[PDB]
């Protein structure tokens, strides 16, 4: 080889992942939606 004219290094390559877009209803998220639907049934249920 000749002496090199410019250098490099082995990198890797991957996408700038995303615009994140978390849930606008992710406050609802940490339970099952049915459990929410059951407790609102249980809301009026225990009340009646």
């Amino acid at each position: 080889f000749s002496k090199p004219f410019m250098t490099l290094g082995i990198s890797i390559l991957y996408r700038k992942p995303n615009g994140t877009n978390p849930g606008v209803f992710s406050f609802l998220n940490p339970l099952s939606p049915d459990i929410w639907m059951y407790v609102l049934l249980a809301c009026l249920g225990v009340s009646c």
Partner: protein, 48 residues
């Protein structure tokens, strides 16, 4: 529903128990009425 689960059993069977004590209050107060009213026959009828 698998994981919350068991308090709904407590939610169900809790208010089943309160039905029995609500009758247990009611007959006991008709016995307070039975001090002033009939034996077991019209003391419970007049209250409802």
């Amino acid at each position: 529903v698998q994981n919350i689960g068991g308090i709904f059993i407590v939610l169900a069977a809790g208010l089943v128990l309160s039905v029995f004590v609500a009758v247990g209050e009611f007959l006991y107060k008709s016995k307070k009425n039975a001090q002033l009213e009939k034996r077991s026959f019209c003391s419970a009828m007049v209250e409802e």
